[PDB]
Design a protein around this nucleic acid. Structure first.
Lengths: 95, 73
RNA sequence: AAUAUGAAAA
RNA sequence: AGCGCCGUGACGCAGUGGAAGCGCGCAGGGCUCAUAACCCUGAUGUCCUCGGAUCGAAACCGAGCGGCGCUACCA
RNA sequence: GGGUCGUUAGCUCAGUUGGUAGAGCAGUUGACUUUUAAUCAAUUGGUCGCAGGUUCGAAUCCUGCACGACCCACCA
RNA sequence: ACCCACUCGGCACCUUACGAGAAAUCAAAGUCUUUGGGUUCUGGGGGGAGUAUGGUCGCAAGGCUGAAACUUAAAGGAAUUGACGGAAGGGCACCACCAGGAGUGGAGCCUGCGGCUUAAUUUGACUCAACACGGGGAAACUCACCAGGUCCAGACACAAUAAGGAUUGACAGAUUGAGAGCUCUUUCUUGAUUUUGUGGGUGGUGGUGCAUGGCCGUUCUUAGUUGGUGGAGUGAUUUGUCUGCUUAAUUGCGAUAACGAACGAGACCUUAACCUACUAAAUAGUGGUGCUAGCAUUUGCUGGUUAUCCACUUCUUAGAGGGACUAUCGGUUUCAAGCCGAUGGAAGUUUGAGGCAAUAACAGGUCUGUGAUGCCCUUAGACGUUCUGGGCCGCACGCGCGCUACACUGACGGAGCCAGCGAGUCUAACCUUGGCCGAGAGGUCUUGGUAAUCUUGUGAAACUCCGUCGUGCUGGGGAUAGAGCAUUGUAAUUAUUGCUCUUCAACGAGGAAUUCCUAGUAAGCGCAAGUCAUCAGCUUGCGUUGAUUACGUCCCUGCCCUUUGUACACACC
């Protein structure tokens, strides 16, 4: 019945120990990346940290810094800021 | 419970009920005079010469002031 | 739709 | 007496010189009041033994062992 | 009649080449349950059917016997 | 051909029981212990067995006639109440599902159970209805286990010993883990209390929870349960307790061979929602005025100050009370109970959640809570009590509660930073403020509080805001080990716990399966209490933030009632 033999309980010992591509974004700018950003952010009707990371291969942190400098140089216009996401446009006079 | 068995051989033998000193007239031997003292008697207030001091290693002990009472005189 | 069995006395 | 065959997981049986598979069985876990069945998983093979050849054989060739089959006709 | 093979626990079966008996069933005990059955755990029982050679020493090697199991036993 | 009445003979049928029957039932199954109209056949417990055998018919299969040995205490018939059904009807439940949410099962760790191990790894419990359970978060105690050592708290009666002494305690040396004289050596001490024995008690977390009380859980969170007197039945029993409709409800409206009642539900009680009302409040506040601080400079704004006072009870505590009663309207149904929608309202699911909670029962859990105990065992090299050290944690594995996460809805740092339930010392030491010291834990000197007065606005966390990041097993996770620093504690070691640095493994949203849940509910997030000397991943409560999807069904698991069948009644296992 329910009680197994000691030899069968030895199958507890016989159980044994058996059981059930990264992306390479920039993270550092160069002259070529610097040229790329000020030529393309005039495009990208919507600019944010994630969009810059996705479509310019910047390492996120430097994407944030570049956004502040793009703001300082005025090519960008704010819609909202937050300590975890920011929303930006091309400083468009169209809207 | 299990049937009990002792690893030690025997331990029930207690100390005797008394030393069996019989008459216990160890006071002194005297020839019809004042028998006086064989052993001395303790100086402590708790005895007041009610006790003969003992002897175990040529030093004396009081069984009434008891325990660490030690004299070596 | 498939659904078998559940020792002896008390 | 001669000659031929087989032997591989617990069981039955496959399989070629790069190494072990099938079904059953076993084992865990779940479902069940519990077992069966069912559902999700897993393992387990001196490949009869010894030796030799080969870079390495279950396989090749010797030895051995065990178990089989055939031949046994003419007087 | 000869050749071969095997006989080990109450029973059954492995063993193993020369260092010593293993497994199951059976029996006893305990756990289990109200008590049993079943199940589980432990224990018992084995000169290995009798005389050798020595591997110091045989259960297994070898010659006897007592059981048995196979195979073969004129001739025209 | 009809229609009406009658008649004879059939097939039957409906209602009743004078009557019959064990009943189901029956106009024959009646005219039957008040036993007799005529007659044929058949049965004598169940099996053996319509078997064997002998006949006889048959082409055969088989038919007719037809035993016995042996075996057994029931077999069987009709109804009753249940239980049960892969039977039907009705109504229901997130311990059921549907639509989903969150998960578990996947990983690590805490914890419990089993297995294994061992001297012991104490033990009870094993589907819901055992496994973060015994309030069981065990370092000694607890503790019941294991290796060892003490002590007796063996009442009392009697017998023995017996103050030319019953008996007790002994320092020290040995022994022992041990300043346990326990025991040995030794000589002292004590003095009727004792010791020895016969009886007899006493204790036991020893056995029995299947011998019991009590308690609880469960059947069983559904609505069920019972008498009196009547009615049916020979009787178990039945009606009352129900056709329909409704309710969460055996809740009612009704029906009615039942009437009138009782427990249950309800009604009830507590708690949670409204009170510009009564009563108020230096143990809660608010405003005004004084005094004071800052900016304004100011006229206004924000603060500090109870002996500055005055006023008030809006907020806060309460006592008594009001309020809700589906209130009103419109639809809808015996046109009733009721339901649906709308209106108002603090609230219109019994307004929300609980407490209590019936008849009957389990051979559910406990004699390890009990000075509650029966019976058995034991009772002094005790299973009593106590002391030292282990163990309850031991690890090849399986299982159950969970706590962490697997990350950008984040991690981290620096800000904003707001609750509630509740608890706390005094003759014993709690909750602790403030100051100082230390990175930290923590240490230090005082302080208030027996508590709406102090801890405490418990200034909690999650949350928001600003920064580091970067899509990567990465700053995710911090398991795992080392070194060190403190606390509680006689004692931490098999690390109690906290902290510092270092170590940085599994874990990529989890297989078959499965848990919980209908709004302040799930879930996230912590806080208080519990046990507590220290220790929480545990539970009991509390509060913050606060969803999705339902608003139905009987498809799975189940429930209650009625009808039905039964060869079941230790009751579908």
């Amino acid at each position: 019945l329910s009680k197994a033999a000691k030899a069968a309980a030895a199958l507890a010992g016989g159980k044994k120990s058996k059981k059930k591509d990264r992306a390479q974004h920039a993270v550092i700018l160069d002259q070529e990346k610097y040229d790329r950003i000020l030529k393309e952010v005039p495009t990208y009707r919507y600019v944010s940290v994630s969009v810059l990371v996705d479509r310019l291969k910047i390492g996120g942190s430097l994407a944030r810094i570049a956004l502040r400098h793009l703001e300082k140089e005025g090519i960008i216009k704010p819609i909202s800021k937050h300590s975890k996401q920011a929303i930006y446009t091309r400083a468009t006079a169209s809207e | 419970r299990k049937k009990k068995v002792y690893t030690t051989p025997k331990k029930i033998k207690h100390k005797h009920k008394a030393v069996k000193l019989a008459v216990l007239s160890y006071y002194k031997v005297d020839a019809e005079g004042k028998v006086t003292k064989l052993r001395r008697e303790c100086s402590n207030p708790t005895c007041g010469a009610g006790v003969f001091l003992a002897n175990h290693k040529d030093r004396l002990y009081c069984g009434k002031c008891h325990s660490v009472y030690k004299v070596n005189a």
